[PDB]
Amino acid sequence: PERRVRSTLKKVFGFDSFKTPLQESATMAVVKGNKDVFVCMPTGAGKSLCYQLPALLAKGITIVVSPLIALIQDQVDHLLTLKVRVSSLNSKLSAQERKELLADLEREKPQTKILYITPEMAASSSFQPTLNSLVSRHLLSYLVVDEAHCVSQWGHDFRPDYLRLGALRSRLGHAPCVALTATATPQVQEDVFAALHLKKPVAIFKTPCFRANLFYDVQFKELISDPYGNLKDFCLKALGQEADKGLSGCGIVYCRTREACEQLAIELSCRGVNAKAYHAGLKASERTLVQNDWMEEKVPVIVATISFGMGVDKANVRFVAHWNIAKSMAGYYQESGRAGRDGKPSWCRLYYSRNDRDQVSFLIRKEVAKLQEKRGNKASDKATIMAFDALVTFCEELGCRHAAIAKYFGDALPACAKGCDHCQNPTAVRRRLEALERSS
């Protein structure tokens, strides 16, 4: 029963438990293999195991489509270290190694247990007879499409090859398809489901974005007496959440231009919150000096361009403030997400300026136009401006800020728990909104 899983998890992979109970629930669903499954867990989640373990409990070959050789390699390497009969069929194989493998697959009782294949190979007619014989002998236990988001023009790593894969699924109707990716907008999931011809009901195992310990809020630069002062106070309030330790933790501030970054470090530091600028303009030595100071807490605050920040990630990041709105909602989630990794309360804040919104809007439009002449028209062109608009929405709506994020990325209603401005004081937000309507 569930008995076998526990065993194979320890005896093979050397694991006492699954990383999360979603990893478990996903894995166990693949194992039943009565329905196709989609796993959208972030990088380092234990996705691989959700098909690697089921592949071995099953009495057949699991084919795993994966979009470049670097990726395949890392896994097939580790899978071998675990003494697992894994084989990549790639174009980095000597024609002799190629042949020896295809020969394996053509035998009854083939050595190979997991087969790592490029989408490229899985399409080529060089592999088709082999593939057919495998299906015909009912030898195919599972079809895994890693990096499934690469079927989607709304996902920004689209691979024309991936479109073949749908046709493939329908041929081996006998066996379950497991689709995996780290991130999917709802539109990408809908594409992934359709273009891979995943059999409804599709079991989904999507890691919620929502993190309790972060407190999101929005302020409007148009309605602020002393911008730089507000910031000072926000930074401070967030720091010294351990008054016994005095000023504990660290924090980040985000800016569009480099001049803004330099200046803001200055203005914050003079106002008494010691801060350094981080941007692509500086030398490599300056970058590592500023980043090193920040890492060791010699400086509590760093000011990074939205173009370039986070040389390395840190745990006690008590606050991430955006002076300027970001390119995309994805971007603000990414950026604000460097906050609070250690799990102790943190504060994320967006400073919203209609003048910012417009200044970015024109730059999006302009380098949308620049690409339409460079290569031409596309579905992704709409998505760029969409991505940004979801963040404008974030600011301009009164409504739970975590639930606004949850909807964008496709998670169900998160339990905010007085956990954002609007959840704590819905009116204050109402009143502040009405205010920017006058100064619009």
Epitope: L22, E190, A203, F205
Partner: nanobody, 124 residues
Framework: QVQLVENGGGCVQATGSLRLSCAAS????????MTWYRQAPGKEREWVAA???????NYADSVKGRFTISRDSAKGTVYLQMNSLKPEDTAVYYC???????????????????WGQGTQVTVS
């Protein structure tokens, strides 16, 4: 699982009106295509009207002008306002929830098609 429960039907005089609801229960996040099928006794199921996420609506030529479907986005529920009713429009009315994305705050979800129970509609 998900429950599709239709309501708002009954017996009415011709040139009457009704309004049918489809209460879609469960942790529904999105319905790709919510469609109104009607089963008139003695005929083949008829496609009536349908609505995509984003509210793109289309209507059978047999009902255009007279019928309108809508989503109370908040309620998570679709309506078929049927005016200028005719004995022809007598049927059982039911939705298909095509591409019904469900998701718990756990992270545990499903993607599936769901068919509603139906509401009886006679027209004198």
């Amino acid at each position: 699982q998900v429950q599709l429960v239709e309501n708002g039907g009954g017996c009415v005089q011709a040139t009457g009106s009704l309004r049918l609801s489809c209460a879609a229960s469960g942790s529904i996040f999105s319905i790709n295509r919510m469609t109104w099928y009607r089963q008139a006794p003695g005929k083949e199921r008829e496609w009536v009207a349908a609505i995509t996420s984003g509210g793109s609506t289309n209507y059978a030529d047999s009902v255009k002008g007279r019928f309108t479907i809508s989503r109370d986005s908040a309620k998570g529920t679709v309506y078929l306002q049927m005016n200028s009713l005719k004995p022809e429009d007598t049927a059982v009315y039911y939705c298909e929830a095509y591409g019904t994305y469900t998701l718990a705050p756990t992270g545990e979800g499903e993607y599936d098609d769901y068919w509603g129970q139906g509401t009886q509609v006679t027209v004198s």
